[PDB]
Amino acid sequence: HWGYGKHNGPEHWHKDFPIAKGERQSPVDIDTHTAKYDPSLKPLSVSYDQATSLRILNNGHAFNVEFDDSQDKAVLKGGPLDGTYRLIQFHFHWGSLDGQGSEHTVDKKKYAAELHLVHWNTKYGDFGKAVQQPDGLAVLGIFLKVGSAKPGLQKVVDVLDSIKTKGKSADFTNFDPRGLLPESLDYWTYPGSLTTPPLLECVTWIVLKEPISVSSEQVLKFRKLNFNGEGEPEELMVDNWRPAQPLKNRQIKASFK
Numbered sequence: 547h548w549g550y551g552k553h554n555g556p557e558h559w560h561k562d563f564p565i566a567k568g569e570r571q572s573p574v575d576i577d578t579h580t581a582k583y584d585p586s587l588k589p590l591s592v593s594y595d596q597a598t599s600l601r602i603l604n605n606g607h608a609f610n611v612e613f614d615d616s617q618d619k620a621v622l623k624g625g626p627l628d629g630t631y632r633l634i635q636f637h638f639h640w641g642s643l644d645g646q647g648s649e650h651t652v653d654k655k656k657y658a659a660e661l662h663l664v665h666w667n668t669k670y671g672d673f674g675k676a677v678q679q680p681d682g683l684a685v686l687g688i689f690l691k692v693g694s695a696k697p698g699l700q701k702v703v704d705v706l707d708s709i710k711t712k713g714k715s716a717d718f719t720n721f722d723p724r725g726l727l728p729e730s731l732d733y734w735t736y737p738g739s740l741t742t743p744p745l746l747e748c749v750t751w752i753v754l755k756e757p758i759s760v761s762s763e764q765v766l767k768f769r770k771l772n773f774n775g776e777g778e779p780e781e782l783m784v785d786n787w788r789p790a791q792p793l794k795n796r797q798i799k800a801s802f803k
């Protein structure tokens with residue numbers, strides 16, 4: 547099955563998922579000089595005050611912090627978006643070393659990690675219908691650099707010991723994702739895809755310019771997770787990122803001057 551190794555990693559994915567070589571694949575390099583300021587873009591509206599987390603899951607690729615998305619609580623709107631997008635989960639991509647791990651790059655710079663807050667367009671009723679539509683998802687991407695600790699991340703870090711291996715989950719209630727946001731909501735945006743199989747071309751990407759800082763100790767704990775299941779040989783969960791894909795016929799827009 548697909549993964550991140552030499553034998554099943556991103557360069558192989560096109561065999562089972564031919565859209566891997568499509569016209570609107572993610573991630574991409576953000577060339578900051580070429581991205582055009584778009585004064586028609588709106589400030590992003592991130593409303594996470596009533597977000598209700600439920601559970602954290604090691605799915606064998608990453609860990610997912612899952613939300614109750616049965617009501618309209620935690621929503622993303624504005625920015626480049628038409629309508630209302632409901633938060634379903636977040637997860638990260640990270641490296642084996644601090645010099646790699648992000649999926650998007652900025653002028654070819656790789657960050658140590660990247661957080662993805664995934665939201666589905668409520669006009670399609672459920673996520674499974676949304677991912678079949680070109681405007682079905684909005685993913686808010688936030689870069690992580692290593693420096694000062696992020697206090698709002700520590701509750702996630704501390705639960706990781708309990709979901710070390712693939713298929714383990716733990717109750718994970720009352721986590722507030724506001725504590726993972728940087729100060730500024732300045733962003734770049736472009737049309738793209740899921741960055742994991744099935745690689746569906748259903749995402750409006752919104753990538754924040756300002757990274758968050760996390761400590762070396764925090765990212766080291768990400769790197770103790772395992773891709774393997776319990777009672778299998780240990781494969782550290784590191785380098786679970788897809789490299790930048792061709793931009794093709796797309797424009798990256800900036801919300802800021």
Ligand SMILES: [N]S(=O)(=O)[C][C][C][C]C1234B567B89%10B%11%12%13B85%14B%1158B%12%11%15B%139%12B%1061B%12%112C5%153B%14874
Pocket residue numbers: 634635662664673677685739740741742
């Ligand atoms: N790296 S990425 O965010 O581009 C795709 C990884 C999350 C994929 C999804 B999980 B939830 B729903 B489940 B189904 B819908 B929503 B998030 B997306 C899909 B699965």
Ligand SMILES: [Zn+2]
Pocket residue numbers: 637638639662741
């Ligand atoms: Zn992701």
